[PDB]
Write an enzyme that holds these catalytic residues in place. Structure first.
Site, mmCIF file in Angstrom:
data_model
loop_
_atom_site.group_PDB
_atom_site.id
_atom_site.type_symbol
_atom_site.label_atom_id
_atom_site.label_comp_id
_atom_site.label_asym_id
_atom_site.label_seq_id
_atom_site.Cartn_x
_atom_site.Cartn_y
_atom_site.Cartn_z
ATOM 1 C CB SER A 1 0.702 -2.903 0.321
ATOM 2 O OG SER A 1 1.790 -2.379 1.083
ATOM 3 C CE1 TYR B 1 -0.330 0.710 4.258
ATOM 4 C CE2 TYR B 1 1.509 -0.855 4.453
ATOM 5 C CZ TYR B 1 0.692 -0.048 3.682
ATOM 6 O OH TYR B 1 0.932 -0.004 2.343
HETATM 7 N N1 NAP Z 1 2.317 3.894 -2.417
HETATM 8 C C1 NAP Z 1 2.391 3.538 -1.144
HETATM 9 O O1 NAP Z 1 3.250 3.545 -0.212
HETATM 10 C C2 NAP Z 1 1.292 2.502 -1.189
HETATM 11 C C3 NAP Z 1 1.689 1.215 -0.777
HETATM 12 C C4 NAP Z 1 0.760 0.152 -0.850
HETATM 13 C C5 NAP Z 1 -0.515 0.383 -1.357
HETATM 14 N N2 NAP Z 1 -0.914 1.694 -1.778
HETATM 15 C C6 NAP Z 1 -2.310 2.139 -1.578
HETATM 16 O O2 NAP Z 1 -3.006 3.245 -2.290
HETATM 17 C C7 NAP Z 1 -3.310 4.216 -1.216
HETATM 18 C C8 NAP Z 1 -2.572 5.508 -1.363
HETATM 19 O O3 NAP Z 1 -1.165 5.410 -1.240
HETATM 20 P P1 NAP Z 1 -0.296 6.509 -2.073
HETATM 21 O O4 NAP Z 1 1.056 5.943 -1.885
HETATM 22 O O5 NAP Z 1 -1.012 6.585 -3.397
HETATM 23 O O6 NAP Z 1 -0.564 7.829 -1.234
HETATM 24 P P2 NAP Z 1 -1.602 8.750 -0.636
HETATM 25 O O7 NAP Z 1 -1.006 10.071 -0.597
HETATM 26 O O8 NAP Z 1 -2.272 8.372 0.612
HETATM 27 O O9 NAP Z 1 -2.706 8.670 -1.737
HETATM 28 C C9 NAP Z 1 -4.079 8.184 -1.433
HETATM 29 C C10 NAP Z 1 -4.828 8.689 -0.396
HETATM 30 O O10 NAP Z 1 -6.097 8.013 -0.132
HETATM 31 C C11 NAP Z 1 -7.078 9.015 0.200
HETATM 32 N N3 NAP Z 1 -7.874 8.686 1.405
HETATM 33 C C12 NAP Z 1 -7.399 8.719 2.683
HETATM 34 N N4 NAP Z 1 -8.317 8.500 3.612
HETATM 35 C C13 NAP Z 1 -9.469 8.440 2.906
HETATM 36 C C14 NAP Z 1 -10.937 8.320 3.306
HETATM 37 N N5 NAP Z 1 -11.389 8.248 4.569
HETATM 38 N N6 NAP Z 1 -11.810 8.232 2.262
HETATM 39 C C15 NAP Z 1 -11.397 8.307 0.995
HETATM 40 N N7 NAP Z 1 -10.139 8.481 0.603
HETATM 41 C C16 NAP Z 1 -9.185 8.530 1.549
HETATM 42 C C17 NAP Z 1 -6.635 10.295 -0.448
HETATM 43 O O11 NAP Z 1 -7.010 11.522 0.255
HETATM 44 P P3 NAP Z 1 -6.654 12.329 1.621
HETATM 45 O O12 NAP Z 1 -5.263 12.819 1.527
HETATM 46 O O13 NAP Z 1 -7.819 13.459 1.666
HETATM 47 O O14 NAP Z 1 -6.814 11.437 2.847
HETATM 48 C C18 NAP Z 1 -5.155 10.136 -0.528
HETATM 49 O O15 NAP Z 1 -4.121 11.081 -0.496
HETATM 50 C C19 NAP Z 1 -3.378 3.358 0.050
HETATM 51 O O16 NAP Z 1 -3.436 3.876 1.410
HETATM 52 C C20 NAP Z 1 -2.454 2.156 -0.054
HETATM 53 O O17 NAP Z 1 -1.411 1.970 0.918
HETATM 54 C C21 NAP Z 1 0.012 2.797 -1.655
HETATM 55 C C1 EQI Z 2 4.959 -1.766 2.829
HETATM 56 C C2 EQI Z 2 5.510 -0.730 1.804
HETATM 57 C C3 EQI Z 2 6.327 -1.418 0.740
HETATM 58 C C4 EQI Z 2 7.603 -1.984 1.311
HETATM 59 C C5 EQI Z 2 8.473 -0.935 2.075
HETATM 60 C C6 EQI Z 2 7.615 -0.204 3.089
HETATM 61 C C7 EQI Z 2 7.954 -0.135 4.414
HETATM 62 C C8 EQI Z 2 9.203 -0.738 4.994
HETATM 63 C C9 EQI Z 2 10.029 -1.573 4.059
HETATM 64 C C10 EQI Z 2 11.103 -2.326 4.494
HETATM 65 C C11 EQI Z 2 11.857 -3.126 3.642
HETATM 66 O O1 EQI Z 2 12.897 -3.868 4.046
HETATM 67 C C12 EQI Z 2 11.514 -3.167 2.263
HETATM 68 C C13 EQI Z 2 10.447 -2.429 1.816
HETATM 69 C C14 EQI Z 2 9.671 -1.626 2.628
HETATM 70 C C15 EQI Z 2 6.369 0.388 2.475
HETATM 71 C C16 EQI Z 2 5.326 1.144 3.255
HETATM 72 C C17 EQI Z 2 4.126 1.276 2.230
HETATM 73 C C18 EQI Z 2 4.297 0.040 1.337
HETATM 74 O O2 EQI Z 2 3.551 -0.284 0.420
#
Ligand code: NAP
Ligand code: EQI
Ligand code: NAP
Lengths: 284, 284
Positions: A142, A155
């Protein structure tokens, strides 16, 4: 026994699309175990699985609560192949708002799920990946783990930790032939942001007027920046694959090239004050 | 009333030297509030106080353990001056050992005490600081916060976390007039680090023969570097003063330059693999 992959947080977002991308691969080489915090949430997963006609035997949904060592080790004994070649630490929690506006429980959960859990996942699998001498692990990276973003303290904290947990481990594992890669993401269309934003209205009751204005002010920038580069979870899974195929994976892969300037400049400033300036006169 | 300082974990090392260096300051300006996890241990604190001839009233000890918000809460309502112009988040513990060799109660404690506790403090003092529109926050940094160290997975995890916690806070905090900055230190003359002698079977009965070997070899390298780079809290506390003195302090103060080239390297490599190579070659 084929490339056995064990992924966490497969109920949605990147954890889902990944599980199905891997499972439905045309070279039927990936046997995936999509774990879920709560199984009752495996509908949309299975639905997508069917939607791709993801062949019989490749995807087996399993429940795995990252904040529970009992739940983790059991989901490990259930790996009939008796081996995991690729582990993907993906579960994670978000948290937004004025630091003083969050709560202890809220804060603990984020670090509980996002960091400790990553430890439980590692502790239970790495051992076995080590005696074997071959293995691959992937952690959903991230931006907030490489740079600091307003109202994203805890976070960005949880994600900065992962940079720590991984990099230190990466060192020791060099001769071990096990592989650690942090898939550094950016905004992406997932269940992640679609709810965690909570309700920006309540904040004013646990903060001063000057921060609250700034909290919406950030939100408005956030929402604009999201609907500009929020990548498709499928595009993101693609990176997970490229790392997987790399014979000698690097410590990190980047899904978006948009945050790479902020980072570059940021590294040219050790005191971290030029960055703070830019980032601030960027959010607001 | 004058410059009030509330320092956390002053029981020993950095925390105790900064406390007394401030209280026994020539200008007699600082009113120190040395806080302890458990008051009993203030013996050695007072010894140094006495030794330094800290006048009567320029230093009063309070008890507060950052792992109990009820505690923190009390410690602030005990700051008779009604304000805390300088807040220092310094307490916290280390953790070394093969990731798998660590315990969960342990991996938790570090995370709960180094990050959450730092959050609890901030959530307590930061507000009034903001409404005052004036403030100063010092948090004890670390190299493990800037880079990954073998068999230091959880600690560098907790340390990197402070980098994000504070860096993100800093960005919001820009216009508010409060200042947050970490004091990035390196090995100093402190018991723990120089007293790492043992390596019990507990480690052995919980890791593989290959890691077991890389564990001690680590300790041996670690004892050497310390024996040649360890800084005594004395200088370290001097750094904290340097910071609070600057009209506008930067986000990161470095107590030593010994590691700048290593992180310098870090800069010029997005993949983070040049470093994992380097820092391994340099540890092992
Ligand atoms: N794409 C984003 O903004 C982003 C950014 C950076 C990294 N990644 C990473 O990948 C994850 C998911 O992000 P997403 O954007 O794909 O959305 P997301 O909707 O949160 O997808 C993944 C989530 O992780 C789960 N999770 C939550 N708490 C948990 C627990 N106690 N045990 C096991 N699983 C659990 C899933 O189930 P539940 O809904 O049942 O909780 C789920 O919806 C991370 O939190 C992380 O930030 C995503
Ligand atoms: C941090 C992050 C990517 C960057 C993004 C986010 C929050 C605020 C923010 C602010 C910026 O000026 C440029 C990018 C982003 C996201 C929240 C989840 C994630 O992966
Ligand atoms: N100097 C290091 O190598 C180093 C490097 C980087 C950063 N810093 C940071 O600042 C710390 C201390 O380092 P030091 O080198 O000054 O020596 P230190 O001996 O750890 O000094 C600070 C200590 O933290 C305390 N503390 C422990 N648990 C606590 C709790 N639960 N609640 C409140 N206070 C608690 C103290 O009290 P008790 O003994 O009564 O527990 C105490 O001596 C961090 O852990 C961190 O690493 C230190």
């Amino acid at each position: 026994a084929r490339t056995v992959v064990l992924i966490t947080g497969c109920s949605s977002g990147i954890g889902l699309h990944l599980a199905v991308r891997l499972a439905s691969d045309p070279s039927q080489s990936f046997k995936v175990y999509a774990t879920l915090r709560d199984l009752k949430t495996q509908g949309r997963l299975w639905e997508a699985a069917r939607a791709l006609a993801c062949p019989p035997g490749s995807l087996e949904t399993l429940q795995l609560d990252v904040r529970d060592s009992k739940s983790v080790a059991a989901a490990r004994e259930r790996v009939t192949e008796g081996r995991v070649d690729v582990l993907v630490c993906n579960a994670g929690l978000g948290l937004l708002g004025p630091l003083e506006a969050l709560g202890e429980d809220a804060v603990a959960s984020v670090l509980d799920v996002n960091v400790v859990g990553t430890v439980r996942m590692l502790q239970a699998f790495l051992p076995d990946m080590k005696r074997r001498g071959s293995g691959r692990v992937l952690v959903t990276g991230s931006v907030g783990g490489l740079m600091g973003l307003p109202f994203n303290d805890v976070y960005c904290a949880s994600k900065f930790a992962l940079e720590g947990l991984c990099e230190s481990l990466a060192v020791l594992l060099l001769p071990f032939g096990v592989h650690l890669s942090l898939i550094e993401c950016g905004p992406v269309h997932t269940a992640f942001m679609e709810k965690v934003l909570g309700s920006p209205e309540e904040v004013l009751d646990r903060t001063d007027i000057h921060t609250f204005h700034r909290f919406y002010q950030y939100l408005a920038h956030s929402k604009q920046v999201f609907r500009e580069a929020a990548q498709n979870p499928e595009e993101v899974a693609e990176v997970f694959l490229t790392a997987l195929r790399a014979p000698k994976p690097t410590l990190r892969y980047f899904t978006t090239e948009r945050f790479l300037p902020l980072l570059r400049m940021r590294l040219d400033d050790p005191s971290g004050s030029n960055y703070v300036t830019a980032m601030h006169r960027e959010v607001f």
